[PDB]
Design a protein around this ligand. Sequence first.
Ligand SMILES: [Zn+2]
Ligand SMILES: [Zn+2]
Ligand SMILES: [Zn+2]
Lengths: 478, 478, 478
Amino acid sequence: MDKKAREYAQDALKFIQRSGSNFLACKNLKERLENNGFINLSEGETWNLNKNEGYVLCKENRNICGFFVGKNFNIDTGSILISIGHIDSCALKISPNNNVIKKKIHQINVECYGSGLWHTWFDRSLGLSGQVLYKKGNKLVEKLIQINKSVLFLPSLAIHLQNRTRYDFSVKINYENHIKPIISTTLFNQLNKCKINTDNSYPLLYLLSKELNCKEEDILDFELCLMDTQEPCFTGVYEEFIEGARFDNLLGSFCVFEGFIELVNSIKNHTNDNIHNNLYISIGYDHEEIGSLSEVGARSYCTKNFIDRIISSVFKKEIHEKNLSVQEIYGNLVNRSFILNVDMAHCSHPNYPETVQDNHQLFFHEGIAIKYNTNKNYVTSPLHASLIKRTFELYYNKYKQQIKYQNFMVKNDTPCGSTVGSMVAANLSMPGIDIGIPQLAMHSIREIAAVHDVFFLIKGVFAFYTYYNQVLSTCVHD
Amino acid sequence: MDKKAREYAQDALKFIQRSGSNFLACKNLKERLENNGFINLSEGETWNLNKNEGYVLCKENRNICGFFVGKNFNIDTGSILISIGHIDSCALKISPNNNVIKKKIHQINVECYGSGLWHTWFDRSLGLSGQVLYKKGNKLVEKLIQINKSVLFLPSLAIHLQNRTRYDFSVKINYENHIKPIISTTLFNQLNKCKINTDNSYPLLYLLSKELNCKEEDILDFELCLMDTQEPCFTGVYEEFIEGARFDNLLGSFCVFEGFIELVNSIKNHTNDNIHNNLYISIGYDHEEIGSLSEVGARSYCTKNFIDRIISSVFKKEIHEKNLSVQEIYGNLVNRSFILNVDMAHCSHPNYPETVQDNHQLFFHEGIAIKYNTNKNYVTSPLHASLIKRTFELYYNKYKQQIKYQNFMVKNDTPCGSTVGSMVAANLSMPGIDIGIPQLAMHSIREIAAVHDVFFLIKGVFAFYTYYNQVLSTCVHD
Amino acid sequence: MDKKAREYAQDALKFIQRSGSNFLACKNLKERLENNGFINLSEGETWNLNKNEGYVLCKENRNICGFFVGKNFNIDTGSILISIGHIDSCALKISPNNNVIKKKIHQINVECYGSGLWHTWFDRSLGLSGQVLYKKGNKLVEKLIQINKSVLFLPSLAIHLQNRTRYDFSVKINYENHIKPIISTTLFNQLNKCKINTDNSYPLLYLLSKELNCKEEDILDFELCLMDTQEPCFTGVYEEFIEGARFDNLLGSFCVFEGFIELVNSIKNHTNDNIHNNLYISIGYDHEEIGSLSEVGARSYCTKNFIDRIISSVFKKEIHEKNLSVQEIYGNLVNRSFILNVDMAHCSHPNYPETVQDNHQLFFHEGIAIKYNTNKNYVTSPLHASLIKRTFELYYNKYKQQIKYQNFMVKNDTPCGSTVGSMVAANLSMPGIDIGIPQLAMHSIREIAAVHDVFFLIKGVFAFYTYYNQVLSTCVHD
Ligand SMILES: [Zn+2]
Ligand SMILES: [Zn+2]
Ligand SMILES: [Zn+2]
C-alpha cells in the first residue's frame, strides 16, 4: 500500500495546486471525469440517459455531480449510492468594490468566506483563483483563471508596536480592518501606468487583463478567491504527510471522485450481477462553509431534481405503460439507498490534549474516521455505520487489503461544526454516514494529513460503492 | 370522563414502560396499529394502496407513519389530515467507543442526546433500550432490546467535598466529565470472567449477549438509549397525575395514534359522507430534540414522498387518462389540508412564577394547550386555531363531552424551543397548529402530567380528524 | 462470601424499604432485636437488668439502643464495647403549616432536613414515612405510618424556559421557593370533596386519614419525612451493587445491629471466657445530619445515662457493701472501652478525580473504610485503628475469611463533614474509630454501594465485638 498510497496522494497533489478555488474544483474534476469517458451533458438541453454510461455535469461551474447508470437497473432490487464531498474551502474571496488606497499602498479588501483560521492567512505569498466575467465584442465571456504567482500579501503587525512576550501579546485580528491584503504601492501603480470604474483596483485589473489578454476596461466583475501560491508537498522526515492548502474536502472530495472513477473502471473493465444494479452518484457540493443554503449547496433542490431527472430519463418507457410515477420509483429506491458524506475530521492534536475525547481519538495512518455526533451534526447512525464497516470487511475478503477505520466523536461539552451529511439525508430521505480522514489544522491555509488515510478513503468510497447491496441483502429486520 | 380519562392514561402507561427509546416507540406503535388491522407495507416492495384500508410503515424502525385512505376520495372536495408527534426524547445515548476504566470502576461514556435536564438523570436506577446489531452466522441480525432491570447508575458527587448549604452549593454538571454512568467494578468484571474489540465495554457486552443469547463477540455495534427503570405510575393523593419518563411527546404521540385509532374504528364501525373523503395520516417523527435534520426527521423528504406515493398509488388510474400530475393533485389537496402538531407544553410552575406569561397560563386538567408564538416556533396561526376550536365545538354537539382548551404563549423576552410544526408545514406547504398538553419538568427524566389532559388530547386529535372539513366548508373568504 | 454477601444485602434491602424514616428505623430495628429474644424495657418503669440477657429500648421512638450484658462481668477486667450508627438521613420533612395553593395546584412546603443533594430529590415519585399523632376518643394515639405509594412529586423546571445547552444551563435550586412538592390540583381536591384547620393540607389530611382509618379532623400534627417509593434493588450487570434510598447509615447501622445480632447469637449458642466479660452496646442515634444537638442525638446525655443505669442496675448489690460508686465503676471500664462509629464513606468517584486523595482512595468491594481526619472529624487515632485491624486478623485465624480494610482520608485543602465518632467519644470518654463502607452519591436520594462491603462491615462489627479484649490484653504500654 506504501506505493499505492503515495501514488494516490501524488494525484491528489496534482489535483490541488490546480484546484485553487471552487470553480477550478468543478473544472478539474469534470476534466478528470471526462478522461475516463463520461458523457458531459448540460442541464439545459434534454436528458436522454443510457444504461452502462457515465455522466458528468457542472451546475453553473460550482457544483460537480458525476453519476453512473448501471447496466440492469431493478426498481424492485436496486439502489442509489451517493458519495458526497463539498468542493470549496475557507478562503479570502475578493469584494466587489475593491479600491483601498491607504498609507500610499494599493490594497484589496477581501471578504472572509467561511469560518477559517484567518490569522494563518497573514504573511502568505497569496495568489488568485476563481471566475472572471469579461467582455469580448458584444458577448459576455466567462473564464476561470488561475494565477499561481504571488500577487497579494496580507501583512501582519510588527511585534514592537504592541506589548510583547506575554500570553502571545494579545493578538486580535479584526476581520474588517486588519484583513486587507496589499497588492501594490501608488508609486509603482502610477509608474507602470504612463508606460473606467473607480470601484475595481487598477493593480488588480492590470493583473487579470494580463491573464485574459484583453483591456482592463473589459473586466466587468469576478468571483475570485485568494489562494496560497506555495505548492502542496509531501512532508515529514519519511515524506509521510501531505499538506498544501484547501484540504478541507478538496482532498476529501478527490477521494470521493477517485473512489468513483475506480468503481466505473471496475464496472467497464473485466466484463457480478449486483454491481450493474445501482445508480452510483458522486456529487461535489458548494457553499458548505457558510451553511449550504445556496442554489448549488447541499440544501438546494439541485441533487433531488438530478435524481428525479435520472429516474425520469432512464425509466422513460416504463412510466407510460405500467403507470408508475417518479415519486413511486424514487421512494422505492430510497429504502436501498445510502449517502456517504466525506469531509475531513480532527486528528488528535498533541499540543492540545484538552480538546479531544478520551476514547474517540483520531491518529494519522490509523484509518478512516467515522464521525459520530450527539446532535446529528454528522449523520452517522450506529446501524448505518455497521453496514459500511461490513463493506470494509468484504473488501478485505476480495482484495486482501484491510481498510482501517476509527470512530470519531467530539466531546459532549464542546460544540462541533455541522456537515452536509444530514442536510442531504433530509433532502433525499436517504440514510447516511459521515466518514473522512483525520487532519490537523482544519480550516487553515495549510492543513496536514496522512498519506495512508488517502489510500483508506479512496478504497473506502470504493468499498461502499462495490459492496453495499451485498451487505444490505444480508440485513434482516423484525 | 373520569373513567375514560383513567383508561386512556392506563394504556399510555402500558405504552410507555414498553417504549424505552425511539426504536421501541416505532415498534410498539406499529404493533398497536397492526392490532386494528392496518396493512403493514414496506418501503421497498411496491405500493398498491386501496380505499377503506389503513396502512402502517416504520421507516428504518425510527419513524412510524400510519395512514388511512378514505373510501371516496375526491380530488375536487377532499383533504389530507395529518397529526404529528415525534417519537423520541432527551436521553443519554451510548457512545460507540465505551470502555472507561477509572478508579477501578467500569464505566460507559454516554452522549447527551437532545437538550435535557441532565442533572435529573443523576442518581437514577438506569436501564437500556434501543437497537442492537449482532451477527448470527453470515447474516446481520437486528434486534430491538429492552432491559427493564437496573444495569447502570450515574452517581452524583457527595455534598461534603465542595462548599455547602448556600445558593445550592454551585452545582455544575460538566457534560463530558461528570456524565459517565458506572456499570461495574474491575473486581467483579474479572471475577465474573474466569467463571475481541477493546472499544466496547465487556460489562456492557456481557449484558447484551445475555439478552440476545449469543456470544459477546457477535455484538457489532448498537444504538442504545439509557432509560429509567422505574415504571410510570399514577401520582398525587387522588391518583390524578401521570409521570414516568419520556413524556415529551411519547405520551403526546400516543394521543396522536390513539386519536387516530379511534378515528379508523369510527370509520370502519357503524357502516357521514365527508368522513370517507380524506387521507388521515398519523406520523411519529424522530430526531426532534436535535432539530429534525435527519433522514427520519421532520425536515426529511420522507413524509413528502409518502404523500406523493399515496397519491400516485391511489390515483394510479386517473393520472393516465385525464392527464393529471402528482403535483397538480397534491397542490389541489393542500388547500384543504391541515397539520396537527402535538408536542407537550409548559404548565404553569408554582415554584417559578417569573417564567410564565400572565394571561397565557397553562394549568393541569384545564384542557389542551394551543401553543402560539412570536417567531412561529409554533406554527399556530389565529385563523387555523379558530378552525380547530370549531372542531372542538362540533365534538360537543355530537358527543356531549366538552373538549377544553387554553391558549399558551411564552413571554416576549424569553426564548422558547421550536417544534416540528413549522418544519413539516414548510415541507408540505400545509397550514398547521401546535397543540399539546401541559406538563411540568419537560425534557427531564420524570415529567408529570394530568390525566384529564390525556382525555382532552385523544378527543382533540379525534375531533380534528372527524370535523375539520365540516368546519372548512363553512369558511367564506373574500 | 458471594452467597453470604448477597444474603446480608438481601436482609438490608428488606430493612430499608420498610425503614422509610428515622421513626420506622427505630421501630424495625426494635422488631429485629426482639425477634432474637431481647427484653424490651421502657425508660419509664425501673431497670432490673440481668446477666446473659439482651435488652432493647427506643428512646421516644427515634433512638434505638440495644445492649447485651455479659454473663461474668468483671469490674477489674471487663469492657464496654459500643458500636454506633445513626438512624436518619437527609430527607424532605414536612413543615407544620403546609397549605400551599399556587397556580391551581395543592402543594406541600417541605423543610430540608440535613444537608442533601436536593436537586436529586426533584422528579421523584415520592412517598411518606414518619410519625403521626391523631386523636381517638379522649386519648392521643401515636402511629408510625408508611405510605409506599407515590403521593408526592417535586417537579423540576422545563429546559425551554431558561438558557440551554451550556455549562449545565446555570441550574440553581432555591431551597425555599423551588422545593415544594405538588400533591394535587384544586380541581380534584374539590371534586373528591363533595363525594377544621386551614394550616394542614386537605390532600395530605385525606391521605393520612385513609391510612389511619379516622377522620381528617382527628389528625393533629405529624413528623413526616418524604421518601422515594422506588424499592431498593441489586444493580450492575452482575447484580453487584445495592442502591435504593437512605443508605447514609441506614445501611450502615443495619450492619451495626446485624453485627450485634450475630454476636449475641454467638454468645447464646454453642454454650470463651472473655466473650461473657463485656457490655456490648449497639445504639442507633438520631439527628446526625443536623449536628446531633438533640435529646436523642449523639451530643445527648441519653447514652451516658444509659450506661450509668446499666452499671447501677447490674452492680446494684456491690455498690452497697464494698462502697463503690457509679463514676468509680464507669471510669474503671472506660480504660478498656471502645467506640465503633459506623457511617458511610466516599468511594473514589470516577467522574470526579479532583476530589479524591491520591493515596487514601476507596473502591467498591475493597473492604471497610477506616476514616482518618486532620481535624478529628473522624475519631480514628492510629493506635486505636491498629487494635481494630488486629481484631480483623483474629477473625481471619478463626473463621478463615479475610476482613478487608482500606484507609480513607479526605484531602487537606477540602473540608469534610464531621460524624458522631468524636461526639460520643467526648461524651463517654471512650477511645474510638470511624469505619464505614464506601458509597457513591452520599446524602442523595439514591446512593449506590457494594455488596461485598456489606459483608465486610457486618463481619467487621462482629470482629470488634468478639476480639477486642483479646487484642487489648496484648497491648503493653511503657
Ligand atoms: Zn469541509
Ligand atoms: Zn417533544
Ligand atoms: Zn450518615
